[PDB]
Amino acid sequence: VYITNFHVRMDTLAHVLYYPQKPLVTTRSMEYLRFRELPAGINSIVAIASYTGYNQEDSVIMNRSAVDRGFFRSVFYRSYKEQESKKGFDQEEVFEKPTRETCQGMRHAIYDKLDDDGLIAPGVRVSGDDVIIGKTVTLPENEDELEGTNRRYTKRDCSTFLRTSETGIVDQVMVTLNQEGYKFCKIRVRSVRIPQIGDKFASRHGQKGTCGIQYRQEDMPFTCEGITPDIIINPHAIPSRMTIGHLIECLQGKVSANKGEIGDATPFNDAVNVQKISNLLSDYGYHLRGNEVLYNGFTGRKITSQIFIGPTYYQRLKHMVDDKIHSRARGPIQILNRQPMEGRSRDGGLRFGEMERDCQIAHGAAQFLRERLFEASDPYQVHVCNLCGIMA
Amino acid sequence: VIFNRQPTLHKMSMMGHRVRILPWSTFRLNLSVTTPYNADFDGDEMNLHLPQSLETRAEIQELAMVPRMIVTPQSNRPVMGIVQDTLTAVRKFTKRDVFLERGEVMNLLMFLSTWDGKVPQPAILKPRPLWTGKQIFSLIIPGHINCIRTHSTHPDDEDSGPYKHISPGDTKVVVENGELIMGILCKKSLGTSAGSLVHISYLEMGHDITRLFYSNIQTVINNWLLIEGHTIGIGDSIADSKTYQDIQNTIKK
Amino acid sequence: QANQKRITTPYMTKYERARVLGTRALQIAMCAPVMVELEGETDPLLIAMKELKARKIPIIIRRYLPDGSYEDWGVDELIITD
Amino acid sequence: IQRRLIKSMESVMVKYDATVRNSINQVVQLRYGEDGLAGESVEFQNLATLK
Amino acid sequence: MGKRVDFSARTVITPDPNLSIDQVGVPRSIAANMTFAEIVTPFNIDRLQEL
């Protein structure tokens, strides 16, 4: 939760998270960062074990029954604005629901969702390319057109669309006047983003990784008490990276779930040892190093090696897979180069650059490289004179 | 498809693949394949270039397929080797201690794709039948492939004296006739290095038989690791109360 | 050059066998006669790969020597590496 | 540096004479690597007559 | 020397150990855009008239 008034604010790109939690192992200076008021993260029970192999490298396996209860389930607000204006002498822009017959440039997106004044009412789902703001500009060429009788199309359509592949429900719409005094409208579309197997989670210790896979509460390894890890991270993360304070937080916070006190992580104490923690952990009936006996989830059998579980504080990151995904087949094309557009929002093509064409001189593939730099991109024909070599 | 990650430093960073279509949103690739591309899974991305004609698609297939590029011209070593949990599990799977009952052999053999249909005879027939990890791993090793490497902990005093071939610690690795006789596997045998048990496969057998070699180690030793599991915990970063005194008296000194 | 005195490897370089199975599969993919008996094959690359092991492909490879000359090897005369 | 090493060598290639020649036909090597063998199939070995 | 291309796609990667070496998971919406032109013959015309 970034600011507490966010329901009033209109900002492009506002993430927010349903269920934040203040940590269970907390530095004593977080009180002056006001991190109990606006916490970003949720505690999670974290096994450190190699389980099915999907959590290898930096990935994370998650519990899918947790993700169904609101865990790391967030909201993404996106905000659009369009400004009516008076530019030419006769040329005015207006908010209005365009008609196919009078308006000129039109697309097959549904315009039935626009109101009488050409603005979606809030609470109306719109997917990519659905029309948020109908805006027509009167075409001054009608004046430029002389004796053209009554031109079929007097009005050109400037209407603004949802960004492609952005689905969501229109949350709020507002209509005001800007500096100049023209009508001005901001519109806030939102969509709830459930953590997928592409999304990106990270602890406080520098351990970042995607989601490998989601097993349901059935399939997760459970303790003797029926506690199943919300999140399982690979043990190989630790040895070369050497974040041990990640191992003590899972330890310090398992005493602080039991005792009911919120532990003290502040960096320099000498009053907190791994040895003074463990003696508090042995009193609640756990192995003092935090290891705990687990049963395999699929086959029921115990897992030979004891697994290290504890509550740990993870953050969900602005980086999600739905916004990084892209695919290109024969789309828009640049004006000057007649090559594919740049960027994901434009349905643009990915760059096949220098280093790549030097790897396929290595492979010795000439016909993949001529197709990749000629046929897939702009093909073209010229007529060349034979005597001079110049074009004809 | 041809499949890329920037920057492409050498030519193993563009390798042709064979599509399999799965749900959700992310490209998915075997973990041995993360060695050439130098890509770990935290927010990475990789391009995909789908070749558009049978004539350029038969170049990828016979030139750039990943099973063809196993061995690099640079250092004349294999590029791809066993990585992460499986290379930890192999070692724990291959010790003398590991004895798999009849129920846990039936599952492992089920993940061998090259398995010839015959359940091998247990190492210990009586009182209770028990297979060994070296006995099941010897069904993975393809063809008749033969190697002698040495384990990392192998002491130097061992090769010289008595117990050369009995190997008290089970360090020396021998593979005779496609059967793992003795020793523990590690980075120096399954990993990428000249002469590793993987590099002898591609050389002696071929690029096709060595594709089924990686996929068997990973599937039968990942589905075994659900029995043992693995972890790091605070109990493993801690020494004796006697060792903490020897570490200080050296510092004060 | 003459059929005598040809100096080139008799083996088929992995670049030639990549462009032979590509060019042959492109012909098969357009109504082209198939030299070998095909059994349950709707895929041209598998058919063209099959013609190769039987040495039935009707292509002669023209190898340019670096000095400007050339040699013509038929796909039967060459020795398939794999 | 990776970009400079490629642009200078990019066109050197093993011709059908097996002589390595750059783009002009000028001879860089009479045989590739002086033994004329692709580098992916070689291994380490001891001579055992030496020493 | 290099240029933006069609028939390309980019997304995150995550492990599937159940695949072979040479396979790759490709999601259905990235595999729905990218198309492969296929020449009709008497062999596949039964399959392609359905597609």
């Binding site: 010795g364 490289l369 | - | 670049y15 002669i60 190898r63 038929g74 | - | -």
Partner: peptide, 22 residues
Amino acid sequence: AGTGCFDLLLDAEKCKYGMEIP
């Protein structure tokens, strides 16, 4: 480069043999 070094020609004499359905 590789795959481009040589040139393919169609052998006209060999096409006259083999049982050919299409």
